Structure formats: structure tokens, C-alpha cells
Predict the structure of Oleoyl-acyl carrier protein thioesterase 1, chloroplastic.
Amino acid sequence: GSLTEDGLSYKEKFVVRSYEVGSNKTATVETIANLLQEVGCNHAQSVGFSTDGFATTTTMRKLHLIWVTARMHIEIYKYPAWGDVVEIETWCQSEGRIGTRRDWILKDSVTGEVTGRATSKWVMMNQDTRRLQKVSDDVRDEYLVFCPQEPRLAFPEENNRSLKKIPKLEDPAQYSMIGLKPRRADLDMNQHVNNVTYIGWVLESIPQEIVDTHELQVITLDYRRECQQDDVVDSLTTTTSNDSQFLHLLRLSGDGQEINRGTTLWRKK
Amino acid sequence: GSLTEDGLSYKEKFVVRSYEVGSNKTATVETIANLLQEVGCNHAQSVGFSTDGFATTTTMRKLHLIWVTARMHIEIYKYPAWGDVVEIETWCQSEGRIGTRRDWILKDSVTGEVTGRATSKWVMMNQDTRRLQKVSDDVRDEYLVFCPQEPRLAFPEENNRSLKKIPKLEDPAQYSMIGLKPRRADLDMNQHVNNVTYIGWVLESIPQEIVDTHELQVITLDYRRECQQDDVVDSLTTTTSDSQFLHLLRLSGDGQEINRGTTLWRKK
Ligand SMILES: O=C(Nc1ccccc1)N1CCCC1
Ligand SMILES: O=C(Nc1ccccc1)N1CCCC1
Ligand SMILES: O=C(Nc1ccccc1)N1CCCC1
Ligand SMILES: O=C(Nc1ccccc1)N1CCCC1
């Protein structure tokens, strides 16, 4: 991979692997989410930021400040087949004191057509107390020289799905997947559960028949709290709807403390 | 990747990804196992065999015959760091009517030094009845033209770790990790649990302190039975000693054995 000519975005090609594909011989949405995370990490390394998933400055490290995902929105049109080359372009934009946004465009390397797009909202937090804080100007200036100044949004639309409010699933849930625990493969280098694992746990409560007759088009996920290595998770889904829509809730098996919420949109094959 | 000049082996380079590394910024043993599976799949595609993990022929497909792993043995000397290029070379060899062996050599692309090696024993089976069958001559001949004729073993040593008999762990187990279930990410394109997942389940019963003070050097795993999508697994470990462990994977309910193995770890 490499930063583009103007240095305000980063591009990378990936060949789809055998173990990365699902029952349709095409890459899974978790493989896509992993690839976005990989190109994001490579963009941060290419300009001097941390490579631990937090993309911090030396000023942030002294203060114990990190960047954490608040929302992740993905919309796939065509999942790449096993052996296909997929080119992903990524960039960041500051959204004031609220936080920053990382966007992605996925294209077919052969045809050049856009096969998917993603957007994620990030917020600054003290890694020890988990307390949020609005971005300081001294930190803001360190990122501005690496982001486009004019707005560049992967989801420009006036009323787009990436910014819609998500409600809390009401009990009883129509479907459920109980007792989900992370293993060592689900942890990152800092021993935290990888953001992608939560996407897999959300999709576990989708019935197999839906998976076999439909394809995932859109997924919007709000992150509220971390699941520790020694925590157990309950995944809850309810149909809200050709197209099929679901409301999702991830909560801790014990007390029922919310860790995630979202919506998925599927379409008939 | 590509088959080598003589066409009797296949080589491929891989750059270590951010999500593929562990707590010490180097690729996990499951990332290595995934890479071996990827280069093996690419070797099968490059010469016309199936690409579903069974490396099957048109004669086998008509008969509903597949190749399944019986044993997997991996020895790593240096785990590649995040961003390193690792070159893996792989080849197959027939071991008579017992089965076929796939071997691997892992090297550092920069220095050329061998950083790891692996060997796996495969056996032929009817995919529907799970009954094993001795490989016929008509099937043997289809593979011979793609394997070296002289022996080429990643583990040549007489009396080596890859061919040692593994005993069954006695109850009670010193350590355990119970209620392990596979998710959709653990399934392959045929909806079977991926072979690598079993390696992760085996290592789940290793205490965190051992993981934090030691590095995995050797792992030998015998495959006995499949864990279905709707099955629950119990992982059992006991210290037999460097640190050595005896492992057992069994179904949470009846206690039916699905896997057994040994791991060897070294102080960092
Ligand atoms: O990766 C970045 N920032 C960034 C900005 C420009 C160039 C390279 C990296 N972030 C992820 C968390 C929010 C900030
Ligand atoms: O805890 C999180 N985010 C998060 C990110 C990754 C995994 C788990 C949780 N947040 C609280 C304030 C909004 C974001
Ligand atoms: O992959 C192979 N065989 C093979 C042999 C030569 C070239 C390409 C593939 N196998 C795995 C199970 C035993 C057979
Ligand atoms: O069922 C298997 N092997 C296997 C392979 C992969 C996953 C699970 C099981 N075997 C029957 C006796 C020889 C090996």
C-alpha cells in the first residue's frame, strides 16, 4: 500500500484468501471489516501515528488518551470472490470537538467499480478511566495536516443510513444466541476484544435460513462498552420489516449491561 | 505465489497483518496454520485439484471421497513480526495406501533463514459415511506426477517429534476451558469447522501465565472426529514436564473425543 499523490488518503490492494470466504465462495463481512482495519492501521503507520489500533500522537500517549470506535457503518454491493483483488482507499476527517471520522471505498481492482463503502465515528477517551473528552486544539492540529480540508464523505446523501438513530431492542427478543465468549484469537496485541468480533457476535443471532437465502447489504453498529476477556455475551435479534431488516442488541449474560446495538439490512439472492 | 521451476513444490510470500499478531507483536500460531492452509489451497488450484480444502480429483468427486487431516505438527523458531514478509514452500508426498503427507518450510524473506516447519498426515474418507478407505492405484497415479519421487521430508530426523504416539489425558485435568462453541467465522465455505479452530480450542486451556512467560515452540495434534456447527467442546490440559502439556478436546455432553495433542513451550 501507499498514500496517494496528494498524501491526504491511503490505498491498498488485497487478494481474497481461502479461509476468508463464506458459504457463497465470497469474502465474509468480518473479512471486509478486518481489511478496513488493516488499511487504517497502514495509513496511521505511513505518517507516524501509533499502530495499536488507537492511532495516537506522542501528546496523547503522555496523557493516556486513545481513540475508540463509537459507530461503524458498512454497505457492501458485491462481496469479492475467492482469489479476487480488492482495492480499498481510506482517509480521515475531523468533525470538531466531537471526534474524527475514518471513511473507506472498496473497489474491484479489475473493473474499477465501487463494490462497497464504510464510515466509522471515533471519540477520544482516557484509556484508564474510560472517561470521554472533547478534542483539544493542540491535538486537533496534529491530525489536520493529514486529512482533506474540503469535506470528503463516503456517504454524502442528504438522508443516509450511516447517521440514523438506533433504538434499544425490547424484551422478548425474537431470536437469540446465548453464552458467547471470546477466545485468544479474538484479542488484539493489547489483549482487548477486536472490534470485528462484535460484528460476528451481532450476526450470530440471525437465523441460518436468513443467511442461506439472503445477503447482508448494510450493517450499522453502535459501540457503548467493552466486553472484557473474561465476560460472557448474549446476542439478541428481532425482525423489524424482498428486503429484511433486523434490530440487534449485545448485552452481558449476567446483569444485562448493554455493550452494543445495531441494525442489518439483507436482500434476496 | 507459483509452483517452483521443477513443478514439484509451490512457493508463496505473505506480509504479516495487524489483526494477525498476538500480545508480543508477532503472528499467532493460528495465523501460521491459516497461512499453511492458504498456500496448500493455492498449490492444489495451480495443478487442477479441488479448492474446498479436500484437494480432490474428478474420480474422488464421483465416488464422494475426500482427504481429511489425521495429524498436524508445527515447529516455530521465530514468529514473524507485524509487517514482515514470510515465504512458505509446500509440497505433497504419497505414503502408500495409508495416506498422503503435506509438508511446509517457513523462511524469512529478508534473511532467507528457516523460521519454522510443518507436516500433516491426510487420510482418504467417504464424506457421507465418514468410513476410511485404502487409496486405490487409479487415484494414486493422479497425484504422483505432482509430488517428488525421492523422499523430501520437512522433518527428516530419525525418531522425531512429528511421529510420536500421543496418550489420552486422564481425569481430572489440571486445567480446563469448557463450553467452547464455534461461530460462523469458524466455519469454512462447506460449513464445516475449520481445522485451525481446533488449534485455538486446544490452546484455550493453557493458563494465561504460561502464555505471558513462554512462547509456543512445538504443537502436535491428532484429529479423531469433527465438531458439528451445533456442538459444544471442553478443552483439557495437564502439565507433563521447557514446559510440556498433554491436551484433550472432547464434546461437552457425552465426553466423546474429537482431538488430542501435546505442546512444548520455551521461556522468553
Ligand atoms: O487513523 C486515524 N487518523 C489518521 C489521520 C490521518 C492520517 C492517518 C491517520 N484515526 C483513527 C482513529 C481516529 C483517528
Ligand atoms: O466503549 C466504547 N467503544 C468501544 C470500542 C470498541 C470496543 C468496545 C467499545 N465507547 C464508549 C463511548 C463511545 C465509544
Ligand atoms: O494438496 C494435496 N495434494 C496436492 C498434491 C500436489 C499438488 C497439489 C496438491 N493434498 C492435500 C490432502 C492430501 C493431498
Ligand atoms: O475426522 C477426522 N479428521 C478431522 C479433520 C478435521 C476436523 C475434524 C476431524 N478423522 C477421522 C479419523 C482420521 C481423521
Q: What stands out?
A: Chain B has two domains: 2-163, 175-267. The radius of gyration of chain B is 18 Å.
